[PDB]
Write a protein that binds this DNA or RNA. Sequence first.
RNA 1: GGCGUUGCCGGUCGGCAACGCC
RNA 2: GGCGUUGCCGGUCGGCAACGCC
RNA 3: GGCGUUGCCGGUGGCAACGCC
Lengths: 102, 121, 124, 122
Amino acid sequence: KLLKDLEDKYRVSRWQPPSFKEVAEELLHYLVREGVLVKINDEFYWHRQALGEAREVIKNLASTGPFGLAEARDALGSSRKYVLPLLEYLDQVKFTRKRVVV
Amino acid sequence: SETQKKLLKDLEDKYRVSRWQPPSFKEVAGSFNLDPSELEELLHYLVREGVLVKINDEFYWHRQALGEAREVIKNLAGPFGLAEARDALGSSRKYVLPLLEYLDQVKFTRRVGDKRVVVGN
Amino acid sequence: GSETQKKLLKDLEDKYRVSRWQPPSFKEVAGSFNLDPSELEELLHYLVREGVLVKINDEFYWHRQALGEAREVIKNLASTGPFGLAEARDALGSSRKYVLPLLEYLDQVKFTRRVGDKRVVVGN
Amino acid sequence: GSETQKKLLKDLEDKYRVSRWQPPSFKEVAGSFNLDPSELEELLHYLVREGVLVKINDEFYWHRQALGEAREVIKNLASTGPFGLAEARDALGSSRKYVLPLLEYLDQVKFTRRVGDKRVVV
RNA sequence: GGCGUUGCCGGUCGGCAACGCC
RNA sequence: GGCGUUGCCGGUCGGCAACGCC
RNA sequence: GGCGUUGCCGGUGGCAACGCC
Protein backbone atom coordinates (compact mmCIF):
# COMPACT_ATOMS: atom_id res chain seq x y z
CA LYS A 1 0.00 0.00 0.00
CA LEU A 2 2.63 2.53 1.10
CA LEU A 3 4.77 1.43 -1.84
CA LYS A 4 1.91 1.98 -4.29
CA ASP A 5 1.12 5.44 -2.94
CA LEU A 6 4.81 6.37 -2.99
CA GLU A 7 4.93 5.38 -6.65
CA ASP A 8 1.80 7.33 -7.64
CA LYS A 9 2.99 10.43 -5.81
CA TYR A 10 6.06 10.44 -8.04
CA ARG A 11 4.20 9.28 -11.15
CA VAL A 12 1.50 11.94 -10.83
CA SER A 13 4.13 14.64 -10.14
CA ARG A 14 6.19 13.58 -13.19
CA TRP A 15 8.86 16.07 -14.29
CA GLN A 16 8.35 18.03 -11.08
CA PRO A 17 8.79 15.41 -8.30
CA PRO A 18 8.54 16.07 -4.54
CA SER A 19 11.67 16.34 -2.38
CA PHE A 20 12.61 13.84 0.31
CA LYS A 21 11.21 16.23 2.91
CA GLU A 22 7.97 16.92 1.05
CA VAL A 23 7.30 13.17 0.91
CA ALA A 24 8.70 12.65 4.42
CA GLU A 25 15.24 5.79 2.32
CA GLU A 26 13.98 2.40 3.52
CA LEU A 27 11.20 2.33 0.93
CA LEU A 28 12.66 4.51 -1.84
CA HIS A 29 15.84 2.43 -2.12
CA TYR A 30 13.56 -0.57 -2.66
CA LEU A 31 11.65 1.03 -5.55
CA VAL A 32 14.96 2.19 -7.05
CA ARG A 33 16.13 -1.43 -7.00
CA GLU A 34 12.82 -2.47 -8.58
CA GLY A 35 13.07 -0.12 -11.56
CA VAL A 36 10.15 1.99 -10.33
CA LEU A 37 12.24 5.02 -9.33
CA VAL A 38 15.67 6.50 -10.09
CA LYS A 39 17.73 8.89 -7.94
CA ILE A 40 18.55 12.21 -9.61
CA ASN A 41 20.14 13.76 -6.51
CA ASP A 42 19.96 13.75 -2.71
CA GLU A 43 16.90 16.05 -2.89
CA PHE A 44 14.22 14.19 -4.86
CA TYR A 45 13.72 11.10 -7.01
CA TRP A 46 11.98 10.66 -10.37
CA HIS A 47 9.60 7.97 -11.63
CA ARG A 48 11.51 6.00 -14.28
CA GLN A 49 8.67 6.33 -16.80
CA ALA A 50 8.53 10.09 -16.19
CA LEU A 51 12.32 10.17 -16.53
CA GLY A 52 11.80 8.18 -19.71
CA GLU A 53 9.71 10.46 -21.90
CA ALA A 54 11.43 13.38 -20.17
CA ARG A 55 14.65 12.09 -21.73
CA GLU A 56 12.86 11.56 -25.04
CA VAL A 57 11.86 15.24 -24.93
CA ILE A 58 15.45 16.37 -24.29
CA LYS A 59 16.65 14.20 -27.17
CA ASN A 60 14.11 15.61 -29.63
CA LEU A 61 15.24 19.08 -28.55
CA ALA A 62 19.01 18.67 -29.02
CA SER A 63 18.15 17.47 -32.54
CA THR A 64 18.37 21.07 -33.74
CA GLY A 65 21.69 21.81 -32.05
CA PRO A 66 22.86 22.60 -28.47
CA PHE A 67 20.56 23.84 -25.71
CA GLY A 68 20.80 25.71 -22.43
CA LEU A 69 18.89 25.25 -19.17
CA ALA A 70 16.27 27.81 -20.20
CA GLU A 71 15.38 25.93 -23.39
CA ALA A 72 15.18 22.66 -21.48
CA ARG A 73 12.63 24.12 -19.06
CA ASP A 74 10.31 25.19 -21.89
CA ALA A 75 10.05 21.76 -23.53
CA LEU A 76 9.36 20.06 -20.20
CA GLY A 77 7.23 22.92 -18.94
CA SER A 78 8.88 22.73 -15.51
CA SER A 79 11.08 25.28 -13.75
CA ARG A 80 14.83 25.92 -13.55
CA LYS A 81 14.47 24.44 -10.07
CA TYR A 82 13.62 20.91 -11.25
CA VAL A 83 15.23 21.15 -14.69
CA LEU A 84 18.74 21.92 -13.42
CA PRO A 85 19.12 18.75 -11.27
CA LEU A 86 17.66 16.56 -14.02
CA LEU A 87 20.03 17.98 -16.62
CA GLU A 88 22.97 17.50 -14.27
CA TYR A 89 21.93 13.88 -13.71
CA LEU A 90 22.05 13.38 -17.48
CA ASP A 91 25.60 14.75 -17.68
CA GLN A 92 26.43 12.11 -15.10
CA VAL A 93 24.88 8.98 -16.61
CA LYS A 94 26.46 10.28 -19.84
CA PHE A 95 23.17 11.01 -21.62
CA THR A 96 24.47 14.53 -22.41
CA ARG A 97 27.33 16.89 -21.51
CA LYS A 98 25.02 24.55 -23.29
CA ARG A 99 24.27 20.83 -23.60
CA VAL A 100 24.46 18.09 -26.23
CA VAL A 101 23.09 14.54 -26.45
CA VAL A 102 26.11 12.25 -26.74
CA SER B 1 6.86 12.13 -47.94
CA GLU B 2 9.39 13.30 -45.36
CA THR B 3 7.45 16.50 -44.55
CA GLN B 4 4.50 14.15 -44.06
CA LYS B 5 5.64 11.28 -41.84
CA LYS B 6 7.39 13.85 -39.64
CA LEU B 7 3.95 15.30 -38.87
CA LEU B 8 2.68 11.96 -37.52
CA LYS B 9 5.44 11.49 -34.96
CA ASP B 10 5.07 15.23 -34.41
CA LEU B 11 1.46 14.82 -33.22
CA GLU B 12 2.25 11.65 -31.28
CA ASP B 13 4.85 13.39 -29.14
CA LYS B 14 2.43 16.28 -28.73
CA TYR B 15 -0.13 14.02 -27.05
CA ARG B 16 2.78 12.24 -25.37
CA VAL B 17 3.99 15.34 -23.53
CA SER B 18 0.44 16.53 -22.77
CA ARG B 19 -0.24 13.33 -20.80
CA TRP B 20 -3.41 13.82 -18.71
CA GLN B 21 -4.15 17.30 -20.00
CA PRO B 22 -4.33 16.40 -23.69
CA PRO B 23 -4.86 19.19 -26.22
CA SER B 24 -8.34 19.18 -27.75
CA PHE B 25 -8.96 18.58 -31.46
CA LYS B 26 -9.95 22.22 -32.00
CA GLU B 27 -6.86 23.23 -30.02
CA VAL B 28 -4.35 21.07 -31.93
CA ALA B 29 -5.75 22.30 -35.26
CA GLY B 30 -4.16 25.69 -34.65
CA SER B 31 -0.96 24.50 -32.96
CA PHE B 32 0.07 22.73 -36.18
CA ASN B 33 -2.16 24.76 -38.51
CA LEU B 34 -4.33 22.25 -40.40
CA ASP B 35 -7.91 21.96 -41.72
CA PRO B 36 -10.83 20.52 -39.63
CA SER B 37 -11.70 16.92 -40.55
CA GLU B 38 -8.41 17.01 -42.48
CA LEU B 39 -6.39 16.57 -39.29
CA GLU B 40 -8.63 13.52 -38.92
CA GLU B 41 -6.71 11.66 -41.64
CA LEU B 42 -3.76 11.96 -39.26
CA LEU B 43 -5.40 11.44 -35.86
CA HIS B 44 -7.51 8.47 -36.89
CA TYR B 45 -4.64 6.76 -38.73
CA LEU B 46 -2.69 6.98 -35.46
CA VAL B 47 -5.91 5.89 -33.77
CA ARG B 48 -6.26 2.68 -35.82
CA GLU B 49 -2.55 2.00 -35.25
CA GLY B 50 -3.16 2.37 -31.52
CA VAL B 51 -0.76 5.26 -30.85
CA LEU B 52 -3.64 7.50 -29.83
CA VAL B 53 -6.85 6.53 -28.06
CA LYS B 54 -10.10 8.45 -28.50
CA ILE B 55 -11.79 9.22 -25.19
CA ASN B 56 -14.32 11.66 -26.67
CA ASP B 57 -15.05 13.90 -29.66
CA GLU B 58 -12.82 16.69 -28.33
CA PHE B 59 -9.50 15.03 -27.45
CA TYR B 60 -7.37 11.89 -27.51
CA TRP B 61 -4.84 10.52 -25.02
CA HIS B 62 -1.52 9.00 -26.07
CA ARG B 63 -1.33 5.21 -25.69
CA GLN B 64 0.92 5.49 -22.61
CA ALA B 65 -0.83 8.34 -20.76
CA LEU B 66 -3.93 6.17 -20.66
CA GLY B 67 -1.94 3.26 -19.29
CA GLU B 68 -0.49 5.38 -16.48
CA ALA B 69 -3.84 7.02 -15.70
CA ARG B 70 -5.29 3.51 -15.50
CA GLU B 71 -2.48 2.61 -13.11
CA VAL B 72 -3.22 5.49 -10.75
CA ILE B 73 -6.91 4.67 -10.97
CA LYS B 74 -6.09 1.05 -10.17
CA ASN B 75 -4.36 2.17 -6.97
CA LEU B 76 -7.22 4.46 -5.89
CA ALA B 77 -9.25 1.26 -5.41
CA GLY B 78 -12.54 0.22 -2.50
CA PRO B 79 -14.99 2.63 -4.26
CA PHE B 80 -14.12 6.21 -5.23
CA GLY B 81 -15.91 9.35 -6.33
CA LEU B 82 -15.21 11.70 -9.22
CA ALA B 83 -13.55 14.13 -6.80
CA GLU B 84 -11.39 11.41 -5.25
CA ALA B 85 -10.37 10.28 -8.74
CA ARG B 86 -9.71 13.85 -9.87
CA ASP B 87 -7.38 14.19 -6.87
CA ALA B 88 -5.88 10.77 -7.54
CA LEU B 89 -4.65 12.13 -10.87
CA GLY B 90 -4.65 15.72 -9.69
CA SER B 91 -6.68 16.71 -12.74
CA SER B 92 -9.96 18.48 -13.54
CA ARG B 93 -13.43 17.33 -14.61
CA LYS B 94 -12.52 18.83 -17.97
CA TYR B 95 -10.39 15.72 -18.55
CA VAL B 96 -11.13 13.26 -15.71
CA LEU B 97 -14.87 13.22 -16.34
CA PRO B 98 -14.24 12.20 -19.98
CA LEU B 99 -11.58 9.62 -19.01
CA LEU B 100 -13.88 8.02 -16.43
CA GLU B 101 -16.69 7.80 -19.00
CA TYR B 102 -14.20 6.07 -21.30
CA LEU B 103 -12.95 3.66 -18.64
CA ASP B 104 -16.60 2.78 -18.00
CA GLN B 105 -17.23 2.00 -21.67
CA VAL B 106 -14.17 -0.26 -21.95
CA LYS B 107 -15.19 -2.02 -18.74
CA PHE B 108 -12.11 -0.97 -16.78
CA THR B 109 -14.14 0.87 -14.16
CA ARG B 110 -17.84 0.17 -13.57
CA ARG B 111 -20.27 2.63 -11.99
CA VAL B 112 -21.60 0.70 -9.00
CA GLY B 113 -23.63 3.47 -7.38
CA ASP B 114 -22.75 7.16 -7.28
CA LYS B 115 -19.18 5.85 -7.39
CA ARG B 116 -17.02 3.73 -9.67
CA VAL B 117 -15.21 0.49 -8.89
CA VAL B 118 -12.14 -0.71 -10.80
CA VAL B 119 -13.48 -4.04 -12.01
CA GLY B 120 -10.75 -6.56 -11.32
CA ASN B 121 -11.83 -8.00 -14.66
CA GLY C 1 52.62 55.26 44.17
CA SER C 2 55.56 57.26 42.85
CA GLU C 3 55.81 58.94 39.45
CA THR C 4 55.54 55.87 37.26
CA GLN C 5 52.08 55.54 38.77
CA LYS C 6 51.51 59.04 37.44
CA LYS C 7 52.47 57.82 33.98
CA LEU C 8 49.95 55.04 34.43
CA LEU C 9 47.19 57.65 34.82
CA LYS C 10 48.38 59.27 31.62
CA ASP C 11 48.53 56.03 29.68
CA LEU C 12 45.05 55.14 30.99
CA GLU C 13 43.60 58.47 29.98
CA ASP C 14 45.17 58.16 26.54
CA LYS C 15 43.68 54.69 26.17
CA TYR C 16 40.28 56.33 26.50
CA ARG C 17 41.13 59.52 24.61
CA VAL C 18 42.36 57.51 21.62
CA SER C 19 39.61 54.85 21.71
CA ARG C 20 37.14 57.74 21.91
CA TRP C 21 33.62 56.61 20.89
CA GLN C 22 34.53 52.92 21.05
CA PRO C 23 36.13 52.96 24.57
CA PRO C 24 37.69 49.73 25.94
CA SER C 25 35.70 47.87 28.56
CA PHE C 26 36.81 47.32 32.14
CA LYS C 27 38.08 43.85 31.12
CA GLU C 28 40.12 45.06 28.18
CA VAL C 29 41.68 47.82 30.24
CA ALA C 30 42.58 45.39 33.03
CA GLY C 31 44.18 43.14 30.44
CA SER C 32 46.09 45.91 28.66
CA PHE C 33 47.68 47.26 31.79
CA ASN C 34 47.64 43.97 33.65
CA LEU C 35 45.61 45.26 36.57
CA ASP C 36 43.60 43.55 39.27
CA PRO C 37 39.95 44.70 39.38
CA SER C 38 40.40 46.45 42.73
CA GLU C 39 43.33 48.45 41.35
CA LEU C 40 41.53 49.39 38.13
CA GLU C 41 38.30 50.31 39.83
CA GLU C 42 40.09 52.76 42.09
CA LEU C 43 42.22 54.18 39.26
CA LEU C 44 39.08 54.83 37.20
CA HIS C 45 37.20 56.40 40.08
CA TYR C 46 40.19 58.65 40.56
CA LEU C 47 40.12 59.64 36.89
CA VAL C 48 36.41 60.38 37.27
CA ARG C 49 36.97 62.60 40.29
CA GLU C 50 39.72 64.43 38.43
CA GLY C 51 37.20 65.05 35.67
CA VAL C 52 39.08 62.95 33.11
CA LEU C 53 36.60 60.10 32.68
CA VAL C 54 32.80 59.87 32.96
CA LYS C 55 31.05 56.59 33.79
CA ILE C 56 28.53 55.52 31.16
CA ASN C 57 27.75 52.15 32.74
CA ASP C 58 29.56 49.45 34.70
CA GLU C 59 31.27 48.25 31.56
CA PHE C 60 32.13 51.52 29.82
CA TYR C 61 33.84 54.67 30.97
CA TRP C 62 34.19 57.44 28.37
CA HIS C 63 36.81 60.16 28.14
CA ARG C 64 35.08 63.41 29.11
CA GLN C 65 36.15 65.04 25.83
CA ALA C 66 34.92 62.09 23.77
CA LEU C 67 31.54 62.44 25.51
CA GLY C 68 31.34 66.16 24.96
CA GLU C 69 32.00 65.70 21.27
CA ALA C 70 29.48 62.92 20.96
CA ARG C 71 26.94 65.26 22.59
CA GLU C 72 27.62 67.87 19.94
CA VAL C 73 27.15 65.34 17.16
CA ILE C 74 23.93 64.15 18.72
CA LYS C 75 22.71 67.71 19.23
CA ASN C 76 23.11 68.37 15.49
CA LEU C 77 21.42 65.10 14.53
CA ALA C 78 18.50 66.02 16.82
CA SER C 79 18.02 69.34 15.04
CA THR C 80 15.85 67.87 12.31
CA GLY C 81 13.59 65.90 14.65
CA PRO C 82 13.60 62.83 16.95
CA PHE C 83 16.16 60.16 16.09
CA GLY C 84 16.54 56.40 16.44
CA LEU C 85 19.49 54.35 17.71
CA ALA C 86 20.50 53.45 14.16
CA GLU C 87 20.75 57.08 13.11
CA ALA C 88 22.79 57.94 16.18
CA ARG C 89 25.10 55.08 15.23
CA ASP C 90 25.44 56.25 11.62
CA ALA C 91 26.01 59.81 12.81
CA LEU C 92 28.81 58.70 15.14
CA GLY C 93 30.30 56.09 12.82
CA SER C 94 30.18 53.75 15.80
CA SER C 95 28.23 50.55 16.49
CA ARG C 96 25.14 49.59 18.54
CA LYS C 97 27.23 47.97 21.24
CA TYR C 98 28.88 51.36 21.92
CA VAL C 99 26.05 53.73 21.04
CA LEU C 100 23.14 52.24 23.01
CA PRO C 101 25.01 52.62 26.35
CA LEU C 102 25.78 56.26 25.52
CA LEU C 103 22.15 57.07 24.75
CA GLU C 104 20.89 55.33 27.90
CA TYR C 105 23.40 57.41 29.83
CA LEU C 106 22.26 60.58 28.10
CA ASP C 107 18.59 59.82 28.92
CA GLN C 108 19.66 59.32 32.54
CA VAL C 109 21.35 62.72 32.85
CA LYS C 110 18.40 64.21 30.96
CA PHE C 111 20.27 65.49 27.95
CA THR C 112 17.92 63.46 25.76
CA ARG C 113 14.58 61.79 26.35
CA ARG C 114 13.42 58.56 24.83
CA VAL C 115 9.78 58.53 23.63
CA GLY C 116 8.83 55.23 22.01
CA ASP C 117 11.89 54.12 20.04
CA LYS C 118 13.23 57.57 19.29
CA ARG C 119 14.89 60.27 21.29
CA VAL C 120 14.68 63.99 21.34
CA VAL C 121 17.31 66.36 22.73
CA VAL C 122 16.01 68.50 25.59
CA GLY C 123 19.36 69.81 26.85
CA ASN C 124 22.43 71.78 25.78
CA GLY D 1 17.59 78.88 2.36
CA SER D 2 19.50 80.59 5.18
CA GLU D 3 18.68 77.87 7.71
CA THR D 4 19.58 75.40 4.96
CA GLN D 5 23.04 76.93 4.69
CA LYS D 6 23.32 76.91 8.48
CA LYS D 7 22.65 73.17 8.47
CA LEU D 8 25.25 72.63 5.74
CA LEU D 9 27.84 74.27 8.00
CA LYS D 10 26.84 71.95 10.84
CA ASP D 11 27.25 68.99 8.52
CA LEU D 12 30.68 70.11 7.34
CA GLU D 13 31.82 70.52 10.94
CA ASP D 14 30.40 67.13 11.88
CA LYS D 15 32.25 65.55 9.02
CA TYR D 16 35.49 66.84 10.48
CA ARG D 17 34.51 66.05 14.07
CA VAL D 18 33.59 62.47 13.31
CA SER D 19 36.65 61.84 11.09
CA ARG D 20 38.94 63.39 13.73
CA TRP D 21 42.49 62.22 13.08
CA GLN D 22 41.82 60.90 9.60
CA PRO D 23 40.02 63.99 8.21
CA PRO D 24 38.70 63.79 4.65
CA SER D 25 40.69 65.66 2.01
CA PHE D 26 39.40 68.76 0.22
CA LYS D 27 38.50 66.63 -2.79
CA GLU D 28 36.62 64.07 -0.73
CA VAL D 29 34.52 66.69 1.00
CA ALA D 30 33.58 68.31 -2.32
CA GLY D 31 32.37 65.00 -3.71
CA SER D 32 30.39 64.09 -0.58
CA PHE D 33 28.50 67.33 -0.27
CA ASN D 34 28.43 67.82 -4.04
CA LEU D 35 30.11 71.20 -3.79
CA ASP D 36 32.23 73.08 -6.29
CA PRO D 37 35.77 74.07 -5.23
CA SER D 38 34.78 77.73 -5.21
CA GLU D 39 32.00 77.04 -2.71
CA LEU D 40 33.92 74.58 -0.53
CA GLU D 41 36.94 76.87 -0.29
CA GLU D 42 34.82 79.72 1.01
CA LEU D 43 32.84 77.49 3.37
CA LEU D 44 36.03 76.15 4.95
CA HIS D 45 37.52 79.62 5.34
CA TYR D 46 34.31 80.57 7.05
CA LEU D 47 34.81 77.65 9.41
CA VAL D 48 38.47 78.48 10.04
CA ARG D 49 37.43 82.07 10.64
CA GLU D 50 34.79 80.80 13.07
CA GLY D 51 37.41 78.88 15.04
CA VAL D 52 35.77 75.57 14.09
CA LEU D 53 38.42 74.19 11.70
CA VAL D 54 42.22 74.62 11.37
CA LYS D 55 44.18 74.27 8.14
CA ILE D 56 46.89 71.66 8.47
CA ASN D 57 48.04 71.78 4.86
CA ASP D 58 46.34 72.26 1.47
CA GLU D 59 44.49 68.96 1.38
CA PHE D 60 43.73 68.63 5.07
CA TYR D 61 41.73 70.66 7.54
CA TRP D 62 41.28 69.37 11.09
CA HIS D 63 38.43 69.94 13.49
CA ARG D 64 39.77 72.30 16.19
CA GLN D 65 38.86 69.87 18.96
CA ALA D 66 40.47 66.92 17.20
CA LEU D 67 43.66 68.94 16.86
CA GLY D 68 43.67 69.81 20.54
CA GLU D 69 43.27 66.18 21.50
CA ALA D 70 45.98 64.99 19.15
CA ARG D 71 48.26 67.53 20.78
CA GLU D 72 47.44 66.12 24.19
CA VAL D 73 48.35 62.67 22.96
CA ILE D 74 51.59 63.94 21.48
CA LYS D 75 52.44 65.80 24.69
CA ASN D 76 52.18 62.62 26.80
CA LEU D 77 54.14 60.67 24.19
CA ALA D 78 57.05 63.12 24.21
CA SER D 79 57.09 63.38 27.97
CA THR D 80 59.59 60.50 28.00
CA GLY D 81 61.95 61.64 25.24
CA PRO D 82 62.08 62.68 21.54
CA PHE D 83 59.73 60.72 19.33
CA GLY D 84 59.77 59.49 15.76
CA LEU D 85 56.92 59.80 13.26
CA ALA D 86 56.08 56.10 13.59
CA GLU D 87 55.80 56.39 17.35
CA ALA D 88 53.41 59.31 16.81
CA ARG D 89 51.36 57.20 14.39
CA ASP D 90 51.13 54.38 16.96
CA ALA D 91 50.15 56.70 19.85
CA LEU D 92 47.37 58.19 17.72
CA GLY D 93 46.34 54.93 16.10
CA SER D 94 46.50 56.64 12.71
CA SER D 95 48.63 56.28 9.58
CA ARG D 96 51.68 58.10 8.18
CA LYS D 97 49.50 59.81 5.64
CA TYR D 98 47.59 61.71 8.31
CA VAL D 99 50.24 62.02 10.95
CA LEU D 100 53.11 63.53 8.97
CA PRO D 101 50.99 66.52 7.90
CA LEU D 102 49.96 67.04 11.51
CA LEU D 103 53.55 67.02 12.76
CA GLU D 104 54.74 69.40 10.02
CA TYR D 105 51.90 71.66 11.04
CA LEU D 106 52.86 71.41 14.70
CA ASP D 107 56.49 72.22 13.89
CA GLN D 108 55.16 75.25 11.98
CA VAL D 109 53.20 76.82 14.87
CA LYS D 110 56.14 75.71 17.00
CA PHE D 111 54.29 73.29 19.26
CA THR D 112 56.99 70.69 18.48
CA ARG D 113 60.45 70.98 16.91
CA ARG D 114 62.09 68.45 14.64
CA VAL D 115 65.79 67.69 15.30
CA GLY D 116 67.09 64.94 13.05
CA ASP D 117 64.41 62.30 12.59
CA LYS D 118 62.75 62.93 15.90
CA ARG D 119 60.73 65.62 17.66
CA VAL D 120 60.25 67.23 21.05
CA VAL D 121 57.42 69.33 22.42
CA VAL D 122 58.77 72.80 23.17
C1' G E 1 22.54 19.35 14.62
C1' G E 2 23.62 21.07 19.88
C1' C E 3 26.14 24.28 23.30
C1' G E 4 29.24 28.44 24.09
C1' U E 5 32.17 32.96 23.09
C1' U E 6 32.96 37.18 20.17
C1' G E 7 31.51 40.91 16.29
C1' C E 8 28.02 43.38 13.33
C1' C E 9 22.82 44.14 12.49
C1' G E 10 17.38 45.11 13.99
C1' G E 11 15.47 48.63 19.88
C1' U E 12 15.90 43.99 22.70
C1' C E 13 15.46 39.82 22.51
C1' G E 14 16.12 37.88 18.30
C1' G E 15 18.99 37.66 12.94
C1' C E 16 23.76 36.91 10.29
C1' A E 17 28.89 35.61 10.46
C1' A E 18 33.81 34.12 13.21
C1' C E 19 35.85 30.94 16.35
C1' G E 20 35.58 26.75 20.48
C1' C E 21 33.55 22.42 21.79
C1' C E 22 30.11 17.87 21.53
C1' G F 1 57.20 43.74 -18.40
C1' G F 2 55.93 49.23 -18.83
C1' C F 3 53.24 53.31 -17.21
C1' G F 4 49.66 55.00 -13.86
C1' U F 5 45.95 55.51 -9.42
C1' U F 6 45.19 54.19 -4.32
C1' G F 7 46.25 52.26 0.52
C1' C F 8 49.50 50.69 4.41
C1' C F 9 54.70 50.70 5.59
C1' G F 10 60.03 53.15 6.06
C1' G F 11 61.25 59.94 7.27
C1' U F 12 61.02 60.90 2.05
C1' C F 13 61.70 58.93 -1.45
C1' G F 14 61.85 53.98 -1.74
C1' G F 15 59.17 48.55 0.08
C1' C F 16 54.53 45.58 -0.08
C1' A F 17 49.52 44.94 -1.87
C1' A F 18 44.73 46.29 -4.61
C1' C F 19 43.24 48.30 -8.91
C1' G F 20 43.42 50.59 -14.34
C1' C F 21 45.77 50.56 -18.86
C1' C F 22 49.58 48.84 -22.56
C1' G G 1 13.85 49.63 7.17
C1' G G 2 16.24 44.70 9.37
C1' C G 3 15.96 39.45 8.70
C1' G G 4 14.24 34.72 7.50
C1' U G 5 11.43 30.83 4.57
C1' U G 6 9.56 29.76 -0.34
C1' G G 7 8.38 30.34 -5.66
C1' C G 8 9.49 32.09 -10.51
C1' C G 9 13.60 34.19 -13.36
C1' G G 10 18.66 34.59 -15.59
C1' G G 11 23.43 29.39 -15.20
C1' U G 12 24.89 31.13 -10.34
C1' G G 13 22.16 37.79 -7.96
C1' G G 14 16.80 39.93 -9.87
C1' C G 15 11.53 40.08 -9.01
C1' A G 16 7.61 38.38 -5.92
C1' A G 17 4.47 35.31 -1.80
C1' C G 18 4.31 34.45 3.37
C1' G G 19 6.38 35.23 8.09
C1' C G 20 9.30 37.31 12.45
C1' C G 21 11.31 41.82 14.15
